[PDB]
A paper describes a structure:
Ethionamide is a second-line anti-tubercular drug used to treat patients infected with multi-drug-resistant or extensively drug-resistant isolates, and is a pro-drug that requires metabolic activation before it can exert its cytotoxic effects. All three crystals contained one tetramer per asymmetric unit, tetramers being formed by two homodimers, the C-terminal domain primarily mediating interactions between the two monomers.
(ii) An electron from reduced FMN then transfers to oxygen, forming a hydroperoxyflavin intermediate.
Numbering used by the authors:
A (entry chain C), B (entry chain B), C (entry chain D), D (entry chain A): 6 to 376
Amino acid sequence: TEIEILAEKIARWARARSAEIERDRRLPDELVTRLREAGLLRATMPREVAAPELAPGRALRCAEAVARGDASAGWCVSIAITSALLVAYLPARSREEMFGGGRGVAAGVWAPRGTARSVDGGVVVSGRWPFCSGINHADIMFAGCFVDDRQVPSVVALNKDELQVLDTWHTLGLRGTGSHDCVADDVFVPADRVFSVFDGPIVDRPLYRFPVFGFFALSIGAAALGNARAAIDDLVELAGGKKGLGSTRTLAERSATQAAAATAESALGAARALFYEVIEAAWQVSHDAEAVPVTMRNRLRLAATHAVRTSADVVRSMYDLAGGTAIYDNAPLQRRFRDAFTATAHFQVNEASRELPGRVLLDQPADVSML
Amino acid sequence: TEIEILAEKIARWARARSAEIERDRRLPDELVTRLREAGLLRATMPREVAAPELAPGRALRCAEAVARGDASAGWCVSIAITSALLVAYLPARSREEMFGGGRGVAAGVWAPRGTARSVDGGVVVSGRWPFCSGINHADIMFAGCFVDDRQVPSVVALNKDELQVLDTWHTLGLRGTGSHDCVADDVFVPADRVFSVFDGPIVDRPLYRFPVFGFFALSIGAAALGNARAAIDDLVELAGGKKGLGSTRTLAERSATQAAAATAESALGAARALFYEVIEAAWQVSHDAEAVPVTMRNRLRLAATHAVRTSADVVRSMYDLAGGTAIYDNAPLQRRFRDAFTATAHFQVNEASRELPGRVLLDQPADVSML
Amino acid sequence: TEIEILAEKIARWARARSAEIERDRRLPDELVTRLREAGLLRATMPREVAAPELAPGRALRCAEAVARGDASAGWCVSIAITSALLVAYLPARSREEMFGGGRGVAAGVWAPRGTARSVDGGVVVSGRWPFCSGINHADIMFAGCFVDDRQVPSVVALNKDELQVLDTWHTLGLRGTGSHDCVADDVFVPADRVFSVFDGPIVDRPLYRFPVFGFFALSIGAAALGNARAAIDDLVELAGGKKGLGSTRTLAERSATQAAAATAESALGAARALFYEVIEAAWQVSHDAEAVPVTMRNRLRLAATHAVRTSADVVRSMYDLAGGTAIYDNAPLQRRFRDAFTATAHFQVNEASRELPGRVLLDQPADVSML
Amino acid sequence: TEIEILAEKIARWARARSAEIERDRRLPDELVTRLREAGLLRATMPREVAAPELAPGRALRCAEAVARGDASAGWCVSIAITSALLVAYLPARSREEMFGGGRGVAAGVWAPRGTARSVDGGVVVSGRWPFCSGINHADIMFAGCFVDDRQVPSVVALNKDELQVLDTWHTLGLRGTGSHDCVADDVFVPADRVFSVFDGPIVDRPLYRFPVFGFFALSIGAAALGNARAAIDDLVELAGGKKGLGSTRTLAERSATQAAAATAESALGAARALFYEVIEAAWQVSHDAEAVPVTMRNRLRLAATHAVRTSADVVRSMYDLAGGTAIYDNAPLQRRFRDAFTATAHFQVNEASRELPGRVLLDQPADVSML
Ligand SMILES: Cc1cc2nc3c(=O)[nH]c(=O)nc-3n(C[C@H](O)[C@H](O)[C@H](O)COP(=O)(O)O)c2cc1C
Ligand SMILES: Cc1cc2nc3c(=O)[nH]c(=O)nc-3n(C[C@H](O)[C@H](O)[C@H](O)COP(=O)(O)O)c2cc1C
Ligand SMILES: Cc1cc2nc3c(=O)[nH]c(=O)nc-3n(C[C@H](O)[C@H](O)[C@H](O)COP(=O)(O)O)c2cc1C
Ligand SMILES: Cc1cc2nc3c(=O)[nH]c(=O)nc-3n(C[C@H](O)[C@H](O)[C@H](O)COP(=O)(O)O)c2cc1C
């Protein structure tokens, strides 16, 4: 059966375990198992490592669907399928070592907080990376660093078991993502596990032509969109039956509630429609000879930021409409709200991420290397 | 050639004549002729009357494109292709009398301000209708009215001939729409020119299964969306070279301008994407045996209203960014701003039009006869 | 010596204990003692009971200043000084029994969830009331109920020790307010501990002429306004030295941060200025023969709701500006944000509370008995 | 007779003539006479020229009251009383020649668009200044320029006589302000009529210690605030009796109208309270030995910008609520809306004018010479 069908069954499992996911700040072993068996943690790795090489719009749709069940579970998918793309940047040898025959789930932090000095055979890298989503269930972490004098950063492929995982993920929401800090202490990395994203993939097929920084941003949008849909579902369910003490008209019988529901539904539908429209436009040209153009990359970053922010606006409105119900820890809207306003802090999709795409639109000078 | 190509060429003619359109509060005869030649003022009339019977997504796209050239010209298309749908509600006799062989352009006011007495072979109708967009170049006006005792309103097909057109269209914007008041003074209308929208079309093909009230609302969305895209285009052109003669930065080099352009471009792209998504979903089920369901109709009204409101927000932001430039009558953004904030007053797509679609979403009792 | 000065000092103690306040969901005994010794938990009780009978603007300024140190502690003041007004509604006998000689701290839940049936010399009452802020440190709770089958509700003064306090206050924010649910089970209340707010106070001096429902709503605004000032203070402190990449381009040096700081500072200051302006206008006419008029009462509720919502907007903007800093449990802004978005759920100051003051502004029929 | 009472009487005369003011793009001679006789066009000139030397809060209150009657007439007072301040910067001779014995009304454009070559006796200046509000009824225009090669601009006091007034004020709103372009062509100006605002006033009394750039900005705030109050007045009066055809309600009987009326009224009241709060605080320290500090100047610019932008938001909400009524030229709200969205373009109070006051709030390096 198609992976989208699988994803939508796993969403329902994630929803059933969402209290435990939050409590333990990690996915239960058997939810991870389901996710692994459906191919969703390696969906975007290349064919050579026994992986679906799933088209980006389908993969992002899967992440959105899981996020509707539970934002943290969906985010773990987003990060796993973004990190998975970097498997296509490794020389065949190290790629086969780490992900061959269906093995390897990847985490990844882009911030180049490592310092790598070169030695015979590779480099020695040290550093501390926060926000290592999914590290609890990943084998490998792709981590950013600077090698020697070099001013353009690099990526090293690290084994989790060479790293120290620090218990730092004490957060408003997205608690189940376990995005703890990781520490490398003079870890040796063979040369064939060091690469530069800017040199581009070794596996040169359309999935890896799709803008890689765009995909990362979109994956955060997929998780936020699915979370916001769940929030509208929560409010609609509550509003039919929620009755005042004094004024007995239900929540749903208030014209303001009706206006707000309509406003939120159309704002979310708009953001989601732009999201998949720009993904498909970029997927089509990822099949062409030339690099996907700056114009197209920009459209992906515009839509991803718009999706995360619109999603936060939608969840905030649903939370506010629920009033005193939602302030309590037992209320589902509470967690959607907390998760929505943790997702907005991400650097790829915050308010500041609108400015560079504005520069591109206004035909102003712009460093678009990471667009 | 495709009618969409014709539409974009007519958009550039409308743009070139936009000052005269506004000054005269009417489209120039030559623009009407071009519009008429391309089939755009009758695009959605049935095959029988020598008309394209154009699919709704294509028709609405043409209106959007003309509105990019000039909002008033685009609105005229919008109202002509919405009124044209009612040609499918006329018995074959009156239909061929008024629209046969390629003749007849329609205007239409839905507000049932007419008062109609039954007589032998028809009715005699009186009333005054405002907002008769396009009456300057229409032959026929479909007008709402109540017949005798009835609580459900009806529609009469009137010849502009029998009508007193009053000079009342002195407005902030959409001046070229000439949406004057029309008066009927004891006008006899034969019975085969009286019908009820609620009894459904006579021509029972998919274009006329498409929700007719939803089409009306969307047509205003189309005009607003096209006008908003022109406003962004105006700002981007202005900001390239506007330097405040007090600082060392053009307008385009200010971080705030960049953020605002990106916010507006993504908000518009999202509204447009939703607009055409729901039209295509409704278009598909318009081919099915059953009437298009309330759920589908609701999405069209949700997206129509979101498109007009978002469009206004977008134009307001571009107007504001342009500062002291835009306050002057010679500035293109001034007119986009005036037009955008005339379009928002329309009853199908104002803030109040969110409430009923909200009642539908919260599964509350709702009169959805005109959804 | 001046109670405003004491409020400031107690604010800084509340801030030093804010982690413990949150952890324990109650104020530490020693902070309660400070608050008691300053007169802040009884500041608005009549002078007959050895209380300051403090003017409403001074009392509300004290609540706001405590809230700046810690929102929950300030909220406790707000609810204490609002409930304390009802001491003026008790017959002199029961008033000296419960509050004589400086004794008694009051809590109060207005919702008439109680059912009371008249028996001999009084009533017996049962019910469950949520949101009993401060019950951990109050002796008396004023609880709303319906007596027999009257349609206008009454208030019973209950001893906390006759109630069952359920552990239900598990919430996004305002954790230290310990606003648990309280249950009465066939509690007997003597008749001179039963009254109706609508019959007016026994102590007929200006403080008790000041609109009582207005005071309650304003007390929520005072806590939200103080929390919001602390959020801005938190962001300004952080923004000076939050450096991005791996070196210097601080958060404070971004145009958007500057524009956002300015927007928030003027919005808060505007809300605060309207808050104290309407309090002082109402204070003056509370000295006149007639009841404070509906027009004045209305201005109080408009200002209170504006203060709470604007405060939430401010805190949300400061939280967002702080990005990945604020998602972590050790960040001050996280708690301001959680607290700000618990305060907004309160029924006196939520978005729905705009509608009735709107009806008064539009001179529409309105039931203003609880304005 | 107190000047605030004269102002509020003159407001009703301006109201009665507002159609003529807009048609002619100038105040009628009879209105100018009333204004001149009340002392409002010279209210802030020093005592030595037979002027009230009116405290700034009283002056700005008068400007706000006139703007409520008609925004353009209020704007004319705003500009006259801001320009009048510069009479305190002239040496005693030419103050006497230009303004002595109660003569002289001043206009003023701060933009240093003039180029002044020094000669014997003074300078020769040429330039073209847009936005010369009130030039139609002013005798003198203070205009910005650079003298020789200085980097700090200067001000010349020009007689309208020696200027070409060009007919360029064709604008969305504020039409009555006749803020035309003025051209100086090799105009000789005695050294006596050349000064730098930065050297400070010659008349060193509190009114001229009050921040002069702050006063200019606030004066635009006063006009925008008065205009916004009139827009709410317009709406409330319309909404009592506006019933649609099938609305089963008036506009006032809709929940959304009520909530919006209350939102707009509190937002305006908040902006107005902050406005006069910071004026009074700045007025107090204008009596102290030192210059008014930067933190105080900053608060005036914050409040000024918040007043103009909030006023625009208020007028847009009232316009939108009025729906199809307000689109027509005969609708009072239409002109309030056009005027409100003309005033927002002013450089002292646009969105960009939030950035410098943000830099002061975040204690960032800032050029505060024109704050
Ligand atoms: C819940 C959450 C999870 C995140 N996960 C990642 C991740 O797996 N990889 C990554 O490069 N960034 C992730 N980020 C964003 C990073 O915070 C970012 O690299 C950086 O620390 C932003 O802070 P700065 O202003 O100091 O540059 C995540 C953010 C959030 C809020
Ligand atoms: C109606 C109106 C009247 C104005 N009057 C004046 C004036 O009398 N003196 C002045 O220095 N600026 C005045 N301005 C300010 C200009 O509009 C504003 O500076 C301009 O939009 C910004 O120009 P810049 O980009 O070159 O800095 C006025 C603005 C408006 C909208
Ligand atoms: C943190 C918090 C504390 C509150 N404290 C009180 C209180 O001490 N007394 C009171 O009448 N309401 C208080 N409220 C308001 C009540 O929460 C509100 O009346 C109740 O939830 C409405 O319930 P309903 O929707 O079932 O009618 C508080 C609200 C919050 C969010
Ligand atoms: C520029 C403009 C053109 C319009 N044209 C039409 C039209 O051709 N047919 C129609 O039924 N409504 C049209 N409307 C909608 C009207 O705003 C609305 O039907 C009516 O004015 C108000 O009815 P009421 O009395 O119930 O408020 C138009 C609105 C605008 C702003």
